[PDB]
Design a protein around this ligand. Structure first.
Ligand SMILES: [Mg+2]
Ligand SMILES: [Mg+2]
Ligand SMILES: [Mg+2]
Ligand SMILES: [Mg+2]
Ligand SMILES: [Mg+2]
Ligand SMILES: [Mg+2]
Ligand SMILES: [Mg+2]
Ligand SMILES: [Mg+2]
Ligand SMILES: [Mg+2]
Ligand SMILES: [Mg+2]
Ligand SMILES: [Mg+2]
Ligand SMILES: [Mg+2]
Ligand SMILES: [Mg+2]
Ligand SMILES: [Mg+2]
Ligand SMILES: [Mg+2]
Ligand SMILES: [Mg+2]
Ligand SMILES: [Mg+2]
Ligand SMILES: [Mg+2]
Ligand SMILES: [Mg+2]
Ligand SMILES: [Mg+2]
Ligand SMILES: [Mg+2]
Ligand SMILES: [Mg+2]
Ligand SMILES: [Mg+2]
Lengths: 141, 145, 206, 82, 143, 100, 63, 67
RNA sequence: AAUCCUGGAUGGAACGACGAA
RNA sequence: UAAUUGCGAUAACGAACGAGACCUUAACCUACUAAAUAGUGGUGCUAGCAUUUGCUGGUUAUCCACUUCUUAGAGGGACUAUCGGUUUCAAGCCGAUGGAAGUUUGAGGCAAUAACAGGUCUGUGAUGCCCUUAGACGUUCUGGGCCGCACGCGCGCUACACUGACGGAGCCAGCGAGUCUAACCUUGGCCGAGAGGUCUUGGUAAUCUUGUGAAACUCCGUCGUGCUGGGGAUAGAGCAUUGUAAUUAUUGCUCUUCAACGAGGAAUUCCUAGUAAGCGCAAGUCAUCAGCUUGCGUUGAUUACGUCCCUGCCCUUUGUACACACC
């Protein structure tokens, strides 16, 4: 047994599990490195926590995330949340607390959602319309 | 990737099957100007004639053009699978032709005339000028002509 | 600076844009000081972002959109007129192309260019239907910073869209030339034309 | 059968779809002096069509006259090489 | 260090593998090629048309390398798409089945894919080695 | 001997009472077991116009039946199995046992 | 090309029949000690800033 | 709005009327003794009662309260 | 220790309906 | 105050109904219970690349361990908590910090008294009276019709194109349904351009269909401002399926035909955040037929956070020749 945790990131309906352990610094995504995420722009959106905290903190540790649910953008957001949360869990359990708390402060200074999942969920569809708030169309004459 | 400059061989609007086909646009969608020729038939014949589809119609040889129209008016000889044909199992001889520029509307006419002299429902409907495919006529096709 | 390498090879341009400085897509957010005050505190700069996409929730409270970065506001005001609703990725791509164009032309920072355009195309006076009843007319009034910014973005995007519709120029380059003409002060830009007619009407109805 | 409109027309331009030597050496001399180059530029300037324009951009970028900075489909961007 | 299909981008891999197969020029083509649409929902045939059997073959090889087992039903579900039924609203429609079926037959012939238990088709060691080496070429072209 | 017992009711607390009394019987007899696997409850939805006639505002009504399903796997002699099926039944609860 | 900057110090209330206008008493940044009441079209907070195209005008205060 | 109803207010007033030398200005302990000392069907109503008891104790610690 | 102050408005057009109960 | 919600005032006191409370649902729990019908890791066997440790995978009787993800059950959690302002300084309101969550947390279910001479005897073996009751208005068989078209309205679907159409690759959801004395959802194999056909298989269903590999979307390319590869109505010919039977084409497929439409006048509808809008998907009806509805999720904006100007609602005061009540 070597130091390892497992965390998760979430969005509307996506879930990104993330196994984090000690290794040589490979960051894979469902079979593949982080450079092949295929929006080609939220690739940079997912590089964010790495580029923020500095890649030196990823040399000792390997992350492997499995993602299911949602659509492409939501899978990306689940990925970045699971990554940041797994890093923070590692630095909480195995490394001291000061590194963890400055890491958390950096993440929450840049963007709050990196470590906590947004609360917005779909409102149900109500009859008389196609959506929740919309109604079909009134005709008086 | 490279630009052929050009020669004076280019021609604008040309003629085939009694139709003034426009040049300066690609061959397939140019030949689709011909009645009885659509995008599928045109792409297929331009493939079977060994023609570069990237080329504009206005730069082609009479060899290529006559080969193409030969394939058009005699398709089944050039391994066209007989279900591309607009008129198969025709109505009289059982053979599978392919109608073109004027034959399309003349054959449409004599079909309507067959149905009318038979006094069938579709023929009476056409003769009155109404819709035939069971569509509704209460609230659509008002300004029918 | 350090080039560090991982078990997964992280490229050097991403390493640099990580640890050198926090850029845009590939542009710095410093050297974009606003010269005209009264729009500071409402154009959110000095909070850099790698892309203009964020799942940010600013429409819950009143003045929270002022803390949303202007480029996300521009992307957001791009996706409209129906078919294009949603599709924020296309807006982001169009924006990236547009800022590349505004760098090759007019080699200043394209972010400085767009904020200059915002500052210049902000209607300062505007009208309203006022009265105590039948005595109804178009009385002129001041315009607030936030509505100035919003109306600026609306005018820019609408002009770009109306230009790009039914012609060959891309939405990207229409937006680019519109932004540049606006930042200069042109009277060819849709936004500036609308601005000056609005201001003239306001002047006339004092 | 009313319009509620009148729908005025346009000039119906006549962009070129084949080129020649005059248009070609014109391209070669006039693509320089352009700080930003793409299909819309090479259609509002030199009156080729977009197909010719894309082929010409690939051609020029091959030998190297116009420098790319991003070559996204539906929007190709090029400047002049110093 | 080790290389596989997953460490290389999809589009580039597939283009490389289809070029390899077109240059190899031995796989198969049925004969009804250059006639068909690949799907009831498409309204035109392909535009390349000097190939694209190689592209589909590369794509399904990638797909079976990723997955455990597949079938013509799955591939029709995947390569099918939005059919414009003119005036009525769009809809998902499965693709043409003979195409993918004969693709899998030709790949079984050349020995990239084998028939699997639990029904369907699976990647064998030969195709695995081949695809890995092609991806190796695809990312050592980077130098 | 490898029996499964499934409980496919609507009344959650009656069902849980049955599951509880079964498992305490199992442990007082010292029987190893896979615990109560609570399957996902399934919601039979039925959507209907409230009105018999057609007129009125188009008001709709979604009735639901919640079906809660549980099961437990046991390893035990058939004598204790048959008396187990002899005991532990409730109103409004459908049970079935299956060997192998 | 003269314009006057004015800082908002007090939001009084909404005005106009449809509520799309707000009365505010401001403080001229330049030439301070001067306070004037003005209409505004959009949203506004205290300590915001306004660009008066003309400074010599105040609205009929609703009192 | 966050107005509370007469059920809450009256129940809190009773709890303060006869359990003052007891619960203090902390909602958590006030909750954890109110569930013990009164029987209530709902956790939500319990928490509302406890919050109002805390507010009333805050009132009491600086001057008295009418009623 | 300095120190002068206020309360306040109007504002166009808009015809008609069988009786029975 | 969302609220006859409450502070309080007080010829009223004390109560009830309604609202609220409540119930369901969605969001938090690396705290409890567990789970080859959901997963994860490890170890066995094994494929490939690297070989130097490793990386990606496969593996049913290889077992071992765990429950973060997933399921549920029992519970916890938020009560506007804490702080600062403001108010007779009370109910309460604003802001900030914290927090999963601080618009009664969000959406719904139930939802008062009094009424409409609202709708429905075509849902009722719920029904009074009248009519009819054996060449019946009963019942049933055949064939038509309810689709019928010079026109006028309403709910909607397609689009009027480059933020685009098309061809390739990429490739991601959720709510749910399904066969018994039946014949359902169908995987996989083969044939066929296609629709579809055929040989088998799984499933009474967290297990199989189904990761429902959905669509819009992204990346590459073709086209190139041309009523044009936009648009795909209207027609002709043929091939398949449902069903006893499709002829006024049931539908599906193929080819050909290629009309208006160039952003819509007076008018007018819906909508304040994961909401509008785009996007498709399951179910309902169903032998076949979705352009409809009921729900589902994917992408996801702008603009208010206010007013009573229009249309109306509530409370009070006021006037009234109104009482089937300003029609
Ligand atoms: Mg919707
Ligand atoms: Mg659409
Ligand atoms: Mg354009
Ligand atoms: Mg596709
Ligand atoms: Mg009269
Ligand atoms: Mg009269
Ligand atoms: Mg294994
Ligand atoms: Mg307080
Ligand atoms: Mg509620
Ligand atoms: Mg009745
Ligand atoms: Mg009868
Ligand atoms: Mg009818
Ligand atoms: Mg309706
Ligand atoms: Mg596409
Ligand atoms: Mg699913
Ligand atoms: Mg079309
Ligand atoms: Mg259906
Ligand atoms: Mg029917
Ligand atoms: Mg219906
Ligand atoms: Mg209205
Ligand atoms: Mg009077
Ligand atoms: Mg009277
Ligand atoms: Mg009157």
């Amino acid at each position: 047994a070597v130091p390892s945790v497992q965390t998760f990131g979430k969005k509307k309906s996506a879930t990104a599990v993330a196994h984090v352990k000690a290794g040589k610094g490979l960051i894979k995504v469902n079979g593949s490195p982080i450079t092949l995420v295929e929006p080609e722009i939220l690739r940079f959106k997912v590089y964010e926590p790495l580029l923020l905290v500095g890649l030196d903190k990823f040399s000792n540790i390997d992350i492997r995330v499995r993602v299911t649910g949602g659509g492409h953008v939501s899978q990306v957001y689940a990925i970045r949340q699971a990554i940041a949360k797994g890093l923070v869990a590692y630095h909480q359990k195995y490394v001291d607390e000061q590194s963890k708390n400055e890491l958390k402060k950096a993440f929450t200074s840049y963007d709050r959602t990196l470590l906590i999942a947004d609360s917005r969920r779909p409102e149900p569809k109500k009859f008389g319309g196609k959506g929740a708030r919309s109604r079909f169309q009134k005709s008086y004459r | 990737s490279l630009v052929v400059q050009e020669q004076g061989s280019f021609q604008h609007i040309l003629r085939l099957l009694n139709t003034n086909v426009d040049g300066n646009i690609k061959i397939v969608y140019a030949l689709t100007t011909i009645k009885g020729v659509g995008r599928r038939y045109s792409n297929l014949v331009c493939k079977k004639a060994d023609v570069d589809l990237h080329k504009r119609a206005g730069e082609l040889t009479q060899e290529e053009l006559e080969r193409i129209v030969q394939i058009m008016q005699n398709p089944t000889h050039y391994k066209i699978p007989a279900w591309f044909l607009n008129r198969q199992n025709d109505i009289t001889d059982g053979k599978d032709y392919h109608t073109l520029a004027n034959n399309v509307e003349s054959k449409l006419r004599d079909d309507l005339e067959r149905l009318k002299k038979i006094r069938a429902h579709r023929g009476i409907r056409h003769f009155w000028g109404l819709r035939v495919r069971g569509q509704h006529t209460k609230t659509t096709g008002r300004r029918r002509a | 600076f350090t080039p560090v390498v991982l078990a997964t090879p992280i490229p050097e341009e991403v390493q640099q844009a990580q640890t050198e400085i926090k850029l845009f897509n590939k542009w710095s957010f410093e050297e974009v000081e606003v010269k005209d005050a009264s729009l500071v505190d409402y154009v959110q700069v000095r909070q850099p972002i790698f892309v203009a996409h964020t799942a940010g929730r600013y429409a819950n409270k009143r003045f929270r959109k002022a803390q949303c970065p202007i480029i996300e506001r521009l992307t957001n005001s791009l996706m409209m007129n129906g078919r294009n609703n949603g599709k924020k990725l296309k807006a982001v791509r169009i924006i990236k192309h547009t800022l590349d164009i505004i760098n090759v032309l007019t080699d200043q920072n394209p972010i400085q260019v767009v904020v200059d355009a915002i500052t210049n195309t902000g209607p300062r006076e505007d009208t309203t239907r006022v009265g105590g009843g039948g005595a109804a007319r178009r009385q002129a009034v001041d315009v607030s910073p936030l509505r100035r910014v919003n109306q600026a973005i609306a005018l820019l995007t609408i002009g770009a869209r109306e230009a790009a519709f039914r012609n060959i120029k891309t939405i990207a380059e229409t937006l680019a030339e519109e932004l540049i003409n606006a930042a200069k002060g042109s009277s060819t830009s849709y936004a500036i034309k609308k601005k000056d007619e609005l201001e003239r009407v306001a002047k006339s109805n004092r | 059968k009313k319009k509620w409109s009148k729908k005025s027309m346009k000039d119906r331009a006549q962009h070129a779809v084949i080129l020649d030597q005059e248009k070609y050496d014109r391209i070669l001399k006039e693509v320089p002096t352009y700080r930003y180059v793409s299909v819309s530029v090479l259609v509002d300037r030199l009156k080729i069509g977009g197909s010719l324009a894309r082929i010409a951009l690939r051609h020029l970028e091959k030998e190297g006259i116009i420098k790319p900075i991003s070559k996204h489909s539906k929007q190709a961007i090029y400047t002049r090489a110093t | 260090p080790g290389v596989s299909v997953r460490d290389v981008a999809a589009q580039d891999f597939i283009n490389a593998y289809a070029s390899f197969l077109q240059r190899q020029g031995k796989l198969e083509v049925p004969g009804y090629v250059d006639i068909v649409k690949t799907s009831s929902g498409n309204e035109m045939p392909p535009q390349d048309a000097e190939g694209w059997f190689y592209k589909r073959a590369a794509s399904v090889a990638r797909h079976i390398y990723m997955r455990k087992q597949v079938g013509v039903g799955k591939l029709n579900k995947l390569y099918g798409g939005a059919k414009s039924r003119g005036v009525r609203p769009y809809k998902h429609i499965d693709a043409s089945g003979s195409i993918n079926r004969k693709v899998l037959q030709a790949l079984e012939k050349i020995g990239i894919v084998e028939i699997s238990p639990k029904g369907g088709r699976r990647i064998s060691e030969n195709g695995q080695r081949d695809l890995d080496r092609i991806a190796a070429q695809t990312l050592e072209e980077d130098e | 001997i490898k029996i499964r017992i499934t409980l496919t009711s609507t009344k959650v607390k009656q069902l849980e009472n049955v599951s509880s009394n079964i498992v305490k019987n199992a442990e007082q007899h010292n029987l190893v077991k896979k615990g109560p696997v609570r399957l996902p409850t399934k919601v039979l939805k039925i959507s209907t116009r409230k009105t018999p006639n057609g007129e009125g505002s188009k008001t709709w009504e979604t009735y639901e039946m919640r079906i809660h399903k549980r099961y437990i796997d046991l390893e035990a002699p058939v004598q204790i199995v048959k008396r187990i099926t002899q005991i532990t039944i409730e109103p409004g609860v459908d049970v079935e046992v299956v060997v192998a | 090309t003269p314009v006057t900057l004015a800082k908002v110090i007090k939001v009084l209330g909404r005005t106009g029949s449809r509520g799309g206008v707000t009365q505010v008493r401001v403080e001229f940044l330049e030439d301070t000690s001067r306070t004037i009441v003005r209409n505004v079209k959009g949203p506004v907070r205290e300590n915001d800033i306004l660009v008066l195209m003309e400074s010599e005008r105040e609205a009929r205060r609703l009192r | 709005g966050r107005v509370r109803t007469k059920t809450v207010k009256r129940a809190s007033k009773a709890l303060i009327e006869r359990y003052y030398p007891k619960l203090t200005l902390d909602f958590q302990t006030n909750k954890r003794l109110c569930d013990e000392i009164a029987t209530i069907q709902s956790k939500r109503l319990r928490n509302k009662i406890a919050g109002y008891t805390t507010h009333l104790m805050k009132r009491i610690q600086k001057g008295p309260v009418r009623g």
